[PDB]
Design a binder for this molecule. Structure first.
Ligand SMILES: Nc1nc(N)c2c(ccc3c2ccn3Cc2ccccc2F)n1
Length: 159
């Protein structure tokens, strides 16, 4: 199965991390947990923001342009990325904008972290119709000493 894991701001705004409101430690741990030991598919820029391959995980980069790092797998096609993951229980799509919008049609599960913070941004998350996504889990968390704004974890599944 294919899953997307994203962190969304107000108005479903998607964004490159490293800092911003997406460096939230507790969200990083939610990500690291759900993304541990599963093959990981990203974009160019989402790969640039990590700087290192995510360990114990095949890392796949969807890019129209050629590879610049042998520690990871570069592919050009959505279907090449899926195949490059082998036969695994769950594939994890990491971002960003263009990569989410390419993989939504084939995904069965969403791992959304809604953050209660606003960013002026022109990149958004794909508009999923609630008529084909069931909320299977939400976990609100207050603003914390390490977490600048509150945040709500959510899992959704296609019906
Ligand atoms: N909910 C949700 N979803 C996501 N795809 C991410 C995330 C938080 C950080 C993310 C995501 C994707 C890439 N990074 C940057 C990064 C990840 C791991 C280590 C170092 C790093 F810089 N949170």
């Amino acid at each position: 199965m294919i899953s997307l894991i994203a962190a969304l701001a107000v108005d479903r705004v998607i964004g490159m991390e490293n800092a911003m409101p997406w460096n939230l430690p507790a969200d990083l741990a939610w990500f690291k947990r759900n993304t541990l030991n599963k093959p990981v598919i990203m974009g160019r820029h989402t790969w640039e923001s990590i700087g290192r391959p995510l360990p114990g995980r095949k890392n796949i980069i969807l890019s129209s342009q050629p590879g610049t790092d042998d520690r990871v797998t570069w592919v050009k096609s959505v279907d090449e990325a899926i195949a490059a993951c082998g036969d695994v229980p769950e594939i994890m799509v990491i971002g960003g904008g263009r990569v989410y919008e390419q993989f939504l049609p084939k995904a069965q599960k969403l791992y959304l972290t809604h953050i209660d913070a606003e960013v002026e941004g022109d990149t958004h998350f794909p508009d999923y119709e609630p008529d084909d996504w069931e909320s299977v889990f939400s976990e609100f968390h207050d603003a914390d000493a390490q977490n600048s704004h509150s945040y709500c974890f959510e899992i959704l599944e296609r019906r």
